[PDB]
Amino acid sequence: SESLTGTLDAPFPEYQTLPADPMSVLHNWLERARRVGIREPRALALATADSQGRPSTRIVVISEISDAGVVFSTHAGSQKGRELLHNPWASGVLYWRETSQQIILNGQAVRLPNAKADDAWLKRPYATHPMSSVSRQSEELQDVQAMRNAARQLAELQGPLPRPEGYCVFELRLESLEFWGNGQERLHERLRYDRSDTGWNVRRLQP
Amino acid sequence: GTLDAPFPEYQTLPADPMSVLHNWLERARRVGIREPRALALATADSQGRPSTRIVVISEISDAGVVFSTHAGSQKGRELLHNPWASGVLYWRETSQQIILNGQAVRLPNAKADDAWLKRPYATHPMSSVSRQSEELQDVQAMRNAARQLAELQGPLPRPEGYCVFELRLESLEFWGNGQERLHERLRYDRSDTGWNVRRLQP
Ligand SMILES: Cc1cc2nc3c(=O)[nH]c(=O)nc-3n(C[C@H](O)[C@H](O)[C@H](O)COP(=O)(O)O)c2cc1C
Ligand SMILES: Cc1cc2nc3c(=O)[nH]c(=O)nc-3n(C[C@H](O)[C@H](O)[C@H](O)COP(=O)(O)O)c2cc1C
Ligand SMILES: O=C(O)[C@@H]1CC=CC2=Nc3ccccc3N[C@H]21
């Protein structure tokens, strides 16, 4: 049995019109996702790779769309952080079950300045600050209750804490994108962009 | 996170992560998670640059998980030269992730024949005419060619490039939302004799 469950109309005029500027398509799709109530449309399955080219994956949230790509925050000492600092190339996929749409985002992640990290940190609900402050993301957790107790002590403040060392913001500066829609008669609609010396090259891909 | 999401394994540390995987997937099916087997699968090219896309896990095997694709696709070409891959399952309803890391191996043609025959026959026409991920020069021509094949009573022959991969796991992580933002992370790594297990900081 085919696994697709999407039933919401998902207009894809861009597959016909081939807009020159793919970030407009990204904005169009994300705005529509917000308006129709897609659940967690910005949950990005982000892939990085280690020193030997072995991929790793996890979900991160896209916090902003920038001129050059998409932005997310994480811990520098995490697996993804360590991998990106050595090999900036990454790829992430958005998949929206309700509309049977995928967006694939490929590019190089760049760590943004601390001033930007400071701002992103302050924009998080302060209830998130204690655990993010005590946790060394992705290192082994030796004592669960100890971590719980330490966070609870910091939570007493009931206000913002200093940005932890290692809390950082990456901009994934895009070099290619794909927009995927279910299409008609299983001719899935794949619109592929690749950065060129000036602007972008645009192609349709076979499903 | 709107549905119940028990994670007793975070407390008990079961020795066999494949048991945990089977149990999580069965639970997902029972509670009615939407498309639980939609795997965001990452591969990488010869420069170490990742690429991603969704594929569906067709079966859970002794060594890992299985999916089908076209050998000439981007993921197929990448796996042919670099077998290492990683995939993530994310279930919004229970705020759970499963991360699967290992090496993908192409299975024999008899296995591919069986997988092909198990697909709904209505999928056979487009899968036969399409060279997945190659540039599409003429949309209507592809549509018309598939329409010609759709008139047949299936099944059609398996197209040469239609293949099955087994992702043989070397590590797994089970992630749950936990309490007080202490997200619960259970990480397994293959050893010479079995599996090592640990908890990770959120
Ligand atoms: C819905 C969801 C969103 C998440 N968003 C982020 C995020 O924006 N940044 C982050 O560092 N981790 C986020 N996480 C946790 C990551 O998936 C992951 O566990 C953590 O970043 C460690 O990844 P790593 O060990 O591969 O580096 C999120 C998890 C879920 C379930
Ligand atoms: C929900 C969903 C499930 C999919 N499952 C598969 C699959 O099992 N096998 C496959 O080859 N493509 C599958 N696709 C299409 C892929 O996402 C992708 O477009 C195609 O495999 C080409 O990927 P590539 O160019 O990166 O190799 C699926 C797409 C969606 C939206
Ligand atoms: O659940 C399905 O059939 C998938 C849905 C969308 C696209 C697919 N492409 C495939 C290509 C080759 C083999 C299996 C696929 N699965 C479907």
For ligand 1, mutation pick of A48, A61, A95, A138 (most atoms within 8 Å of CB) = A61
Q: Which residues of B75-104 are buried (b: 16+ CB within 10 A; e: fewer)?
A: bbbbbeebbbbbbbbbbbbbbbbbbbbbbb
Picking from A124, A167, A187, A203 by the largest number of B CB atoms within 10 A of its own CB, the best residue to mutate is: A187
Is B74 touching ligand 2 by the criterion CB < 6 Å? yes
Quote the Cα angle for B71-B75-B80, to 5°: 60
Q: B48, B53, B54: which is closest to B84 by C-alpha?
A: B48
Tokens of A31: 């705005």
For ligand 2, mutation pick of A97, A188, A192 (most atoms within 8 Å of CB) = A188
- The answer to whether A190 and A207 are in contact (CB under 8 A) is yes
Please tell me whether residue B151 adopts helix, strand or coil conformation: coil
Please tell me whether residue A104 adopts helix, strand or coil conformation: strand
Rounded Cα–Cα distance for residues B147 and B126 (Å): 8
Q: Dihedral sign, CA of B20, B22, B28, B30? A: negative
Query: Would you put residue A85 in left (φ > 0), alpha (ψ -120 to 50) or beta?
Result: alpha
Alpha-helical (H) ranges within chain B are 9-12, 17-31, 74-81, 109-118, 124-129, 139-150
Query: Which helix (H) or strand (E) segment is A155 a member of?
Result: helix A144-155
- Residue A60 phi/psi, 5-degree rounding, is -130, 160
Is B73 touching ligand 3 by the criterion CB < 6 Å? no
Ligand 2 atom closest to the CA of B67, numbered from 1: 8
Tell me how crowded residue A141 is: count the other CB atoms within 10 A of its CB. 19
Which residue on chain A is closest to B85 by alpha carbon? A55
Q: B109, B36, B102: which is closest to B63 by C-alpha?
A: B102
Tokens of A187: 């001719």
Q: Which of residues 108-167 of B touch A (CB under 8 A)?
A: 120, 122-123, 125-126, 130-136, 139, 142-143, 146-147, 150
Pairing outcome for strands A64-65 and A167-184: unpaired
**To the nearest 10°, the Cα dihedral for A103, A106, A111, A117?**
0
Q: A13, A9, A179: which is closest to A98 by C-alpha?
A: A9
Tokens of B130: 């399409």
Amino acid at B179: Q
Pairing outcome for strands A167-184 and A101-111: antiparallel
Please enumerate in sequence order all residues whose Cβ is within 8 A of that of B181, keeping only pairs 6 or more positions apart, or say none: A127, A128, A130, A131, A132, A151, B202
Is B73 touching ligand 2 by the criterion CB < 6 Å? yes
- The answer to whether B149 and B129 are in contact (CB under 8 A) is yes
- Residue A79 phi/psi, 5-degree rounding, is -60, -45
Ligand 2 mean position, distance from CA A26 (Å):
20
- Ligand 2 atom 3: residue of nearest CA: B55
Q: A106, A122, A117, A128: which is closest to A176 by C-alpha?
A: A106
Please enumerate in sequence order all residues whose Cβ is within 8 A of that of A150, keeping only pairs 6 or more positions apart, or say none: A134
Report domain extents, chain B.
1-202
Q: Which fold has domain A1-207?
A: Pnp Oxidase; Chain A (2.30.110)
Q: A47, A7, A48, A42: which is closest to A26 by C-alpha?
A: A42
Which approach determined this entry? X-ray
CATH number of B1-202: 2.30.110.10
Rounded Cα–Cα distance for residues A191 and A35 (Å): 22
Please tell me whether residue A58 adopts helix, strand or coil conformation: strand
Is B175 touching ligand 1 by the criterion CB < 6 Å? yes
Bridge partners of A171?
Answer: A71, A110
- Residue A9 phi/psi, 5-degree rounding, is -55, 140
- Residue A35 phi/psi, 5-degree rounding, is -65, -40
Rounded Cα–Cα distance for residues A131 and A168 (Å): 15
Resolution in A: 1.6
Tokens of A57: 């994956």
Q: Is the peptide bond before B155 cis (omega within 30 degrees of 0)?
A: yes
- Residue A87 phi/psi, 5-degree rounding, is -135, 100
Report which DSSP code applies to B155: P
> C-alpha distances in angstroms, A106 versus A53, A81, A190?
15, 17, 15
Alpha-helical (H) ranges within B90-194 are 109-118, 124-129, 139-150
Please tell me whether residue A137 adopts helix, strand or coil conformation: coil
